[PDB]
Amino acid sequence: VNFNFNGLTGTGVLTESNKKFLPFQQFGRDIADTTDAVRDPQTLEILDITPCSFGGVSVITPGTNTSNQVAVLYQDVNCTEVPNVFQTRAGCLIGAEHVNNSYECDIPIGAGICASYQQSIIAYTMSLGAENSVAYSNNSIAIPTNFTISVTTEILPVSMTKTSVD
Amino acid sequence: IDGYFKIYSKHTPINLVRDLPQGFSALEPLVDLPIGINITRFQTLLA
C-alpha cells in the first residue's frame, strides 16, 4: 500500500511491531536514519513499516540467431507476490523449466542458479564444474603418461585510442 | 529554546545517603509549554 502516517509518506507493507514505545514517542529510525516503525495515530498499536519487495529484471535468453524464447528474472522477489515458476534464494524465475541436471553455467542468474538452452530454455542448480571424486589414498600416485600441447589465447589491453579532449 | 518551555521529570529508586548514584537514567518529556519567555534566574521553594 501507499501510506501516510501523520505526515510520514511512502509505499510499503504494514506489519505489527513488538517495540515498547514510551508514551510520548511516536516513531523510530534505523542505522540509515530512515523511518522503520510508526505508532498508528488512531489506535495505539506499534507498527513496523517496510517498503514493498522490488528488484531488477534480467532477461535470460539464447541469441536471436537461435530462438526467441525467453525467461524472466525477478531478483529477490518472492513468488507469491509476482502477479514454470522456480523459487530460489535469488528470486522467482518465470519461463524456464526447472530440471534436476546440473550443467556448466551459460547465463548466470545468481545465488546458485544458472540457465542454458538445451531444444528449450532450462533453469537448474548450478554445477561448480561437473563432479570428480578423486581416488585419493595415502598410498596412491597418479602420473601423466602421454601429454598434449594446447595454446590458449589470453588478451590483455595495452593501449587505447589516444584521444585528447581540449 | 525556540518557543518551547520544556519540562522533564524522572522517578526512580535511590539508595545513597549523601550523594548522586552511579548508573544511568534519561529524562522523558512530559509537556511542551508554548510560552516565549526569557528565563535567567530561579529560586528553589522548600517546605
Partner: protein
C-alpha cells in the same frame, strides 16, 4: 541512479533523464563492478575444472586437516575454524532506498564448495591439477616436492615428519586461539568489510544530507514543492546526490582497482602459492613458502601460508 535519486517519482526520474546517459554509465559501471567480482571470484576459486572431494576416511598422511576442511557435523558444509572466521567476520533498510545488494552467483555454500574442492585438490594433487587433470598424491610427498622446490632437501621433512605434523597442528591451534582472542588479527578483512559498510552507511547518510536543499527527504520534497520551484530544488538535489553517488562509484572504482590488484595478487598467490610452489622469496608470506590454504570468508579469502623460518643460530667460519 533512477531509483536511488528519484525514488518512486516519475516526474523526478523524467527530470533526471535530462542528464542523458549518466544512468547508463553509472549502472553500466556498477554492473561491470558486480561482474568484476564474479570474474575475480571465479579467477581465485573457480579456476579448477572439476570439483574434487576427499574420501570419507581423512587419513592425510598423519597431518590432520579436519580444522580447515568442512565438517559433516555442521548442517552447512563449513569448516570449524573457517566457521569461526565467518562468525567473527540492515540489508532490507539498504534495499528500501533502492541501493540493493546482488547475491553472488556462488552462494556461501558454493564458496565453501570451491574452497573445499580447491583445498582438496591442493592436498590430493599438488600443482598438477592447476595445469590439467588432477593426479592423486599423498601429502608428505607433496611436502617433499615443495621443499625440493624451495631448495630444502627432502630428508629434513621425512626425518622430522612427526614433529613437523605436531608443529603444524599446534600452529593451527595458535591460529584458532589468536583469531578467537585478538580482534585486530583480522584487520585486513575487517577493513574491507568496514570500508564497504562505511561506503553504504555513508551513502545512506548522504541520503540524509541536505546538500543545500530545503530538505534532505525526497518524498517530502515532492509532497511540498510544485514543479516550478521543485525543478530548481530537485536540480540542486540531483547535482548534490548524483555527485555523492558519483563519488561513491568513483570510490568503488578506485577501491575496486585496489581490490582488483589484490584479486590479481590473490589469484596469482592462489595459483603459485596454493596450486604450486613459489620460488619468489617473501612473496607468499614471511619465510620460505611451502604451501597455502584457501579459506572462505565473507566477500573474501584468507590464506594460511605454511612457511619455513630459521630459528636457532650457530656461527661458523667460511671460505670462498
Amino acid at each position: 541512479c533512477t531509483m536511488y535519486i528519484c525514488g518512486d517519482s516519475t516526474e523526478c526520474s523524467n527530470l533526471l533523464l535530462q542528464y542523458g546517459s549518466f544512468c547508463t554509465q553509472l549502472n553500466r559501471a556498477l554492473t561491470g563492478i558486480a561482474v568484476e567480482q564474479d570474474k575475480n571470484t571465479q579467477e581465485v576459486f573457480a579456476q579448477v575444472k572439476q570439483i574434487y572431494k576427499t574420501p570419507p576416511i581423512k587419513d592425510f598422511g598423519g597431518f590432520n586437516f579436519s580444522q580447515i576442511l568442512p565438517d559433516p557435523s555442521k548442517p552447512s558444509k563449513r569448516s570449524p575454524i573457517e566457521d569461526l572466521l565467518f562468525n567473527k567476520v540492515l540489508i532490507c533498510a539498504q534495499k528500501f532506498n533502492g541501493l540493493t545488494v546482488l547475491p553472488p552467483l556462488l552462494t556461501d555454500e558454493m564458496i565453501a564448495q570451491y574452497t573445499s574442492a580447491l583445498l582438496a585438490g591442493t592436498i590430493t594433487s599438488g600443482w598438477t591439477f592447476g595445469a590439467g587433470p588432477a593426479l592423486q598424491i599423498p601429502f608428505p610427498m607433496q611436502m617433499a616436492y615443495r621443499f625440493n622446490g624451495i631448495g630444502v632437501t627432502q630428508n629434513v621433512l621425512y626425518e622430522n615428519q612427526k614433529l613437523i605434523a605436531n608443529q603444524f597442528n599446534s600452529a593451527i591451534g595458535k591460529i584458532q586461539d589468536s583469531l578467537s582472542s585478538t580482534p585486530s588479527a583480522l584487520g585486513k578483512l575487517q577493513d574491507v568489510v568496514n570500508q564497504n559498510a562505511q561506503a553504504l552507511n555513508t551513502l545512506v547518510k548522504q541520503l540524509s544530507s541536505n546538500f543545500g536543499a530545503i530538505s534532505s527527504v525526497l518524498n517530502d520534497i515532492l509532497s511540498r514543492l510544485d514543479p516550478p520551484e521543485a525543478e530548481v530544488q530537485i536540480d540542486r538535489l540531483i547535482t548534490g546526490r548524483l555527485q555523492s553517488l558519483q563519488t561513491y562509484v568513483t570510490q568503488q572504482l578506485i577501491r575496486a582497482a585496489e581490490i582488483r590488484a589484490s584479486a590479481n595478487l590473490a589469484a596469482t598467490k592462489m595459483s603459485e602459492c596454493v596450486l604450486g610452489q613459489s620460488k619468489r622469496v617473501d612473496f607468499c608470506g614471511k619465510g620460505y613458502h611451502l604451501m597455502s590454504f584457501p579459506q572462505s570468508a565473507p566477500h573474501g579469502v584468507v590464506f594460511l601460508h605454511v612457511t619455513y623460518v630459521p630459528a636457532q643460530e650457530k656461527n661458523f667460519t667460511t671460505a670462498p
